[PDB]
Amino acid sequence: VDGDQCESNPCLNGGSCKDDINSYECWCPFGFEGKNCEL
């Protein structure tokens, strides 16, 4: 489980962590952006 980028919900504000291939993608609610939804 090396593609366990959704271990401790890295994304912020109250977003979800989705996986792609090797790395992850965060899914933020409508109005938030960033790598780990920081804005």
The CATH number assigned to the domain holding 18 equals 2.10.25.10
Experimental method: NMR
The DSSP string of 1-39 is ------SS--S-SS-EEEE-SSSEEEE--TT--TTTT--
Residues 3-12 as b/e (b if ≥16 CB within 10 A, e otherwise) read eebeeeeebe
Residue 4 labelled as part of a binding site? no
Residue 5 labelled as part of a binding site? yes
Q: Which residues, 6+ apart, have CB-to-CB distance to 36 below 8 Å?
A: 10, 11, 12, 15, 26
Q: How many residues comprise the chain?
A: 39
Instruction: Determine the structural domain holding residue 25 and report its residue range.
Output: 1-39
Residue 27 pairs with which residues in a beta bridge?
16
Residue type, 20: D
Number of domains in the chain: 1
The answer to whether the beta carbons of residues 27 and 19 sit under 8 Å apart is: no
